[PDB]
Design an enzyme around this catalytic site. Structure first.
Site, mmCIF file in Angstrom:
data_model
loop_
_atom_site.group_PDB
_atom_site.id
_atom_site.type_symbol
_atom_site.label_atom_id
_atom_site.label_comp_id
_atom_site.label_asym_id
_atom_site.label_seq_id
_atom_site.Cartn_x
_atom_site.Cartn_y
_atom_site.Cartn_z
ATOM 1 N N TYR A 147 -8.851 2.295 3.252
ATOM 2 C CA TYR A 147 -7.789 3.251 2.977
ATOM 3 C C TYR A 147 -8.007 4.100 1.731
ATOM 4 C CZ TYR A 147 -6.153 0.212 -0.747
ATOM 5 O OH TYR A 147 -6.067 -0.543 -1.890
ATOM 6 N N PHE A 162 -4.664 7.568 -6.330
ATOM 7 C CA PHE A 162 -4.152 6.436 -7.095
ATOM 8 C C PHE A 162 -4.781 5.091 -6.704
ATOM 9 C CE2 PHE A 162 -1.169 6.939 -3.522
ATOM 10 C CZ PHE A 162 -1.133 5.655 -3.014
ATOM 11 N N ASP A 163 -5.172 4.935 -5.445
ATOM 12 C CA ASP A 163 -5.833 3.707 -5.016
ATOM 13 C C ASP A 163 -6.743 3.972 -3.819
ATOM 14 O OD1 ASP A 163 -6.558 1.021 -4.672
ATOM 15 O OD2 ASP A 163 -4.704 0.511 -3.612
ATOM 16 N N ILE A 213 4.056 -1.658 1.604
ATOM 17 C CA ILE A 213 5.163 -0.707 1.633
ATOM 18 C C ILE A 213 5.600 -0.473 3.071
ATOM 19 C CG2 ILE A 213 4.599 0.512 -0.521
ATOM 20 C CD1 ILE A 213 3.410 2.732 1.401
ATOM 21 N N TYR A 222 7.437 3.879 -2.736
ATOM 22 C CA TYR A 222 7.926 3.272 -3.966
ATOM 23 C C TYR A 222 9.270 3.815 -4.460
ATOM 24 C CZ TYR A 222 3.537 0.981 -3.796
ATOM 25 O OH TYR A 222 2.478 0.205 -3.402
ATOM 26 N N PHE A 240 -2.122 8.739 2.999
ATOM 27 C CA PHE A 240 -3.060 7.645 3.148
ATOM 28 C C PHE A 240 -4.077 7.954 4.230
ATOM 29 C CE2 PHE A 240 0.197 5.202 0.914
ATOM 30 C CZ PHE A 240 -0.552 4.331 0.156
#
Lengths: 119, 122
Positions: free
Chosen positions: A27, A37-38, A57, A94, A111
């Site tokens: 991902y 961010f990730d 999430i 979030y 994503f």
């Protein structure tokens, strides 16, 4: 209510994750402005989690399980080998608070996901 | 994985089981381990309807009502329509190390008497 799913690549279309199933994925996490961010790959392993159980999430839980198996309109199913883009509104992510400084308040998240396997 | 403690006070039909994304209707009383009541369907004056298995209610309810999302669990009896059960929910399946003070304190185990009146409207 529901996340937005776009299919980059089709998958077998026979194996589907069900709530409480394990899945393995690759991902990318980016904010709408394109900043990351990730990411699983840079981390150096694919990521395995339990889906449908609030362990990730809600946007992931809905997308990966096809709305807990109920489905939704314009929610394409995601199956092993599928590659997709998931656009997740803040309440499915979030939220109003966010997780600063990692993710800001009220952020939509984008994503890039590949579903390697189920269970 | 933490699991709630479920005791079947009275068996139900043993045929009708909720799955994740189903709707349920229940009567419930919630008490702290000291016996003090914090919430009730009776105080509301109507039974409570919700979607189970999707994070709409505390995790302990989601697990109990769906039998761990259809996976099952060790010593986790299934709850069917008409069942009366007592659910003991550890803090991490309810409100947490923090709580929701003053409604519920930090690190609180919750004991629920539940009756499952219906699934998906029937």
């Amino acid at each position: 209510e529901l996340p937005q799913i776009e299919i980059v690549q089709e998958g077998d279309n026979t194996t589907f994750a069900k709530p409480g199933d394990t899945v393995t994925i690759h991902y990318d996490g980016k904010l709408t402005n394109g900043k990351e961010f990730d990411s699983s790959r840079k981390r150096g392993k694919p990521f395995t989690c339990t889906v449908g159980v609030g362990q990730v999430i809600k946007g992931w839980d809905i997308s990966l399980t096809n709305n807990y198996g109920k489905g939704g309109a314009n929610l394409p199913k995601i199956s092993k080998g599928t590659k997709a883009i998931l656009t997740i509104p803040p309440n499915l992510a979030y939220g109003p608070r966010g997780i600063p400084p990692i993710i800001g308040p009220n952020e939509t998240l984008v994503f890039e996901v590949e579903l390697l396997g189920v269970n």
